[model samples]
Target: VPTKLEVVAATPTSLLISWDAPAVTVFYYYITYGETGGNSPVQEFTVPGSKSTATISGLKPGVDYTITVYAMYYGKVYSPISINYRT
Candidate 1:
């Protein structure tokens, strides 16, 4: 837990996220997102692989979303979820 992990935010027809390179050790990103209108936003997904960045596609525009990122490795998902800013 010494290596710092940081994620940057973006909007594209999806959420474009860039994170600090995790120590290469079979790590994965788990994202769970939902809308703020008291309804589901779309979905949660694991990024394609252990890349430092991920773009989550197929999101609804103008909807406030709450996104949570989990660090996945060895069947463990760690958390300290983040608050997002969007258009």
Candidate 2:
């Protein structure tokens, strides 16, 4: 199983997210985040295979955000949303 996803941010404008690598190696990661339960345009980040943590910035404070994580392997997208986070 993937490690429990975690997030930390000293300020509302930025977020530091971390998780464990899956049993199978992933070439990279796709992280999506934005306001929760809203149609606001979501933001995505690309995390290199050498890392399992990412920092996302430029966010509005006091707004709940939903984060979805995905892994790409063998040059193909894997099953989406391996896990989720709320902040």
Candidate 3:
């Protein structure tokens, strides 16, 4: 069982996604995004601390992209991906 995933906020240049967790406590966040999938290494930015909120930047306006969030539990880590577009 897991918490419900949600996109708190989104724009062509950034995004703020969050979720509620009980299974895992105290977590870090990261985002994997790019123009297209299956290319090379996607951009990865580790959240400074546990804010349960993420802000994505350096994105081209008017372009759609896929974003993913990674949560670390003890030693295990998991990432759930979502999609969005810019204004």
lDDT of each: 0.60, 0.74, 0.62
lDDT of 3 by residue, 1-87 (tens): 225656777676666666665465645655677665446577878763357666777777876566666666667666564555443
Poorly placed runs, candidate 2 (over 4 Å): 82-87
Give the top-scoring candidate (TM-score). 2
| Residue-pair clashes per candidate | 0, 0, 1
Q: Indicate the worst ten consecutive residues by lDDT in candidate 3.
A: 78-87
Pairs of colliding residues, candidate 3 = 12-86
Find the 10 residues in a row with the least total lDDT in model 2. Answer: 78-87
lDDT (Cα) of model 3 = 0.62
Stretches > 4 Å off in candidate 3: 38-40
Clashing pairs in 2: none
Query: Best candidate per lDDT, number?
Result: 2
Root mean square deviation (Cα) for candidate 2: 2.4
